[PDB]
Amino acid sequence: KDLKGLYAALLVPFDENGQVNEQGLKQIAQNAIETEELDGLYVNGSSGENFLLNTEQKKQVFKVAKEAVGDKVKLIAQVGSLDLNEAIELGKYATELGYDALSAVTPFYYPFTFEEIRDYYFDIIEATQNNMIIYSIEQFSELFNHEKIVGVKYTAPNFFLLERIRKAFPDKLILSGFDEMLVQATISGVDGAIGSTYNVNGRRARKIFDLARQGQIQEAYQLQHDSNDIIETVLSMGIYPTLKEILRHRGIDAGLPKRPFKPFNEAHRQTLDQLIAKYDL
Amino acid sequence: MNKDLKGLYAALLVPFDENGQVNEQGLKQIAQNAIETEELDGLYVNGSSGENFLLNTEQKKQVFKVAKEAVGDKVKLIAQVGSLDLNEAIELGKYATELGYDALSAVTPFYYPFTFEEIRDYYFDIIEATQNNMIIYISIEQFSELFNHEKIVGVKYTAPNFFLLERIRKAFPDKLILSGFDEMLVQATISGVDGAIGSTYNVNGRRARKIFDLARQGQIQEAYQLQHDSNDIIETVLSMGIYPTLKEILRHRGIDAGLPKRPFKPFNEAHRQTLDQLIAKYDL
Amino acid sequence: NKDLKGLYAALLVPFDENGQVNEQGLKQIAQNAIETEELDGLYVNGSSGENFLLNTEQKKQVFKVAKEAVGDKVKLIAQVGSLDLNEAIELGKYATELGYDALSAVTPFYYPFTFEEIRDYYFDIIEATQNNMIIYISIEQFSELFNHEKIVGVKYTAPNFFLLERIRKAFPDKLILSGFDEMLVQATISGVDGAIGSTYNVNGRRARKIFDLARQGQIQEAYQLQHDSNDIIETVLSMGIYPTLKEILRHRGIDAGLPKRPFKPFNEAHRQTLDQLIAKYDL
Amino acid sequence: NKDLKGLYAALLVPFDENGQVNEQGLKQIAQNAIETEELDGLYVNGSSGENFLLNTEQKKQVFKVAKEAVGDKVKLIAQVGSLDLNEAIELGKYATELGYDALSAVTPFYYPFTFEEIRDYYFDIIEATQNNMIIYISIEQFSELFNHEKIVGVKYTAPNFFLLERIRKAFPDKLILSGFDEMLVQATISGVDGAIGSTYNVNGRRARKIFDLARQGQIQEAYQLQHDSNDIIETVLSMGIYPTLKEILRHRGIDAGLPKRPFKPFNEAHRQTLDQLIAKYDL
Ligand SMILES: [Cl-]
Ligand SMILES: [Cl-]
Ligand SMILES: [Cl-]
Ligand SMILES: [Cl-]
């Protein structure tokens, strides 16, 4: 699979004890593809509350998400972990399930050197033999020299650096991670995008992407205005519980956020009701 | 009428002699280069790019006078008069206004942690004393309060944040927005800016105008290709010392581009070959 | 109940080439801290132990080995913080059952958690474990955390001596343990109750003198020992702090193993400079 | 040639409604610093003096008045830094001609100047004035700056006590004056030669006691005085430091005038809390 296109960053529903609700998760995954008409799912990224999960729950998410959608759906498995043994084990498990590529967040918390960051990606690639999507221009170059590093999920909203990476690496995949600047990413030549709000707003996101590349820039930007009202509202109410409340409105068992995230605050119910009416969410 | 000042502006560079005095003939050549050669809509005079904050009050007036004399009546003129000395800001604002500059602008008061009310009344005091239109440099609720002033016509927007820019464009459809980041002109353009102010348009304003025009005509691919070209230029000049290097490019065209004012140091000759290579490649 | 004041080694962990805990060396490292470095306690599974690189089973393994290594009088604090609250609760219960004197938990990180989220993360761990807790934010918020009788103190790592003085003043009944070895003398005169540090694994004798001399008002001599300690700290930082501390320990005949990847091993290009440091300061 | 050790008031300036210096109030403020606060010297035309808001003639005016207000024993440091280097040299010569013991200059700001540009700005002022200079940057770059015979020290304002300790150790013979009032006690035990502060205009007596007691090793008493000083500092920062400090002086019968716009005057809604602090601390 060419990995171009638009991906929902897959949300995960939990019960009160922080266990995955598998029925709700299957429904969320199918919502992304069938209702929001997206190209694929980005599984166990930050938007999935991945970093709050134990290893067996991560595996549980990968399997459920894979068995919920058809064979033509593009699937990217985020497997980064500060525990490299865990990253490799998740990488092998996702590869065996048939995920089209892995990705891995930059090793964090500790001040890792670039050399340490580089060999963390190279070690995961070596053990899994799958394609890898990563998260400075001389450094990018050394990462992207690797033929199995097919791309970057670019989340730093610096359009100068984006433009430099675009031109420097015309043949690698660039997927942007900032929903609220989709139209700017699009005219900057990204090959697609990954976003949490595409779970509820993937149809507008598609129009933004398509229309911007078709020269219809005013129309794409108007839809960005509309999408940015939604994104701003959802951010102000607590992004992941509120996205899942919007889904729950659709009859989906969207459950609860995993503690220490708190549930949607009902003080926001009226404003959320107004948003959902305004934009037909 | 808030949109009268739309368009593309050179942030006017200033040549100095060895004692940090304005070279007036070189300044006239720079102003004329921006309008006649680079084909820009106007000059932004005494901003950061003119080393404004290194100047005494007399030198600022001198630059305002010469820039204005150098251009025809149809060329748009914006006078940056911000200063931590509010008395000086008012003096320069009155002076620039009597000269016939079409608006004033003023950088956000800096150095000290000023409160928003102090920043607000800094602008309100300049406006009250000069009665000219004002362009500002802060949340959306804070923008709303500043833009409720009939004489605050718009903003020169330099924050690298396209979420806030979009929010501002949506919230203030009839205010002037001019972007100040040359390396993101194409993104600013599709985000609905009414124009741009740039130091690199002194040497690259023809590409800048094509980027602006092609992007608004939806020729997005061709606009973006010109942004790649411009960004090679911008990245190169930033790496050599922006103001001195821009002036060296101007010197190549036969302009009396002089020196930067200390404590900026002159163009370092170790960069000479890399610069000549850039000038040849992009025909600068 | 033990008094928790005093000086603690942040316990380092030796690994084999597969990132598995070396139980033999871990025991030697724990015993070095108490018996050679003369420290009051161990701070187990903190950042310095490469805790955030471990799986749950390995964290329990380290808790168990450290406890087994030390006498009944040794103070033991178990860092159980995790982005996975279920894991943090489970490690908290396990360490309490081992008999650890207090738990601590890093601030939930990575995500932009609200304060109420952070507060209730601490309160949740407490309800489940019933152990005393040490936290890692304005004075107004500290008040809300310290209001809890089971939040007994703070391991204070932010390099800001104005916030430190305010917290000391406002909360005279709470334990403050500073985590910046290179500013021990400044923390001591600011009234901290003790300190936790990774370099006390190799420089614990000098740290005790800094602490004691400074409280006794012999400030000039404490500050000279801070100069000497900071030569060591700067050097060790410039070489990769965790691998280098463990190299110094190896020199005393401890099986200090390897760091866990993605941390890289001690670069041998540093060996001569490290040999010199060990000679100069008799480490 | 005066030694420059000790405690300096960062001289506050009173203005009228048009932003002109109230010269009579300025003398009162200079004299209060030396005669009531019992301070060693005055730091003139720094940030606390609203210096960067002034025109050249006003800066000269402030230098002249402050000098004439104090006796021959008083140490005087003239801050002459400006983004206009021609103005800085002019001010440098003027202050030198009036007999200021040293010059100082803030780090060139606003633009992103290279270290080579910052270095040559200092070197240029020194070369035109021939006076001693205090600077405001890594250790290697400090080593290059301090290699100049006429760079005699540094007004150290970065709240970083690891770098302070490194500088103190690497430059045993240079003058280090700290600029953080709220951390005077930590600076003192770190071996600073003295301190410059705006709050010493109203609290120099406590400041001196903190400085002397800490150096005499009565660290518990010095720390308590810092608790009281930080109460004051935390309150006046919360109300707008410059205007509030001057309001405290007005209360002493001093003509404290107004701040220069765009600073706003003291807001009367803080009156109650201020009166209460002045009461508690006898200011
Ligand atoms: Cl994600
Ligand atoms: Cl400018
Ligand atoms: Cl630790
Ligand atoms: Cl000052």
Residue numbers in the entry:
A (entry chain D): 3 to 137, 148 to 293
B (entry chain B): 1 to 137, 147 to 293
C (entry chain A), D (entry chain C): 2 to 137, 147 to 293
Please share text taken word for word from the publication where this structure appeared.
NAL is a class I aldolase, functioning through the formation of an enzyme–pyruvate Schiff base formed with Lys165 which carries out a nucleophilic attack on the aldehyde carbon of the open-chain form of the N-acetylmannosamine. Here, using the NAL from Staphylococcus aureus, we demonstrate quantitative conversion of a cysteine residue, site-specifically into the nonproteogenic amino acid γ-thialysine, chosen as a mimic of the natural catalytic lysine residue at position 165, using the double alkylation-elimination method and that high yields of an active, modified NAL can be purified.
Initial modelling of Lys165 in all four subunits revealed a strong positive electron density around the gamma carbon of the side chain of residue 165, thus indicating the presence of a more electron-dense atom. Subsequent replacement with γ-thialysine side chains correctly accounted for this density in the Fobs−Fcalcd map and showed the presence of γ-thialysine in all four subunits of the enzyme. The chemical modification of the enzyme has not altered its overall fold. Alignment of all of the Cα atoms of the K165-γ-thialysine structure with the wild-type structure resulted in an RMSD value of only 0.13 Å. Interestingly, the crystal structure of modified enzyme showed no evidence of d-thialysine at position 165. The γ-thialysine residue is found to be in a fully extended anti configuration within the active site, as is observed with Lys165 in the wild-type enzyme. The average Cβ–Sγ and Sγ–Cδ bond lengths in the four γ-thialysines in the tetramer are 1.8 Å and the Cβ–Sγ–Cδ bond angle is 97.2° (compared with 1.82 Å, 1.81 Å and 102.9° in free γ-thialysine).
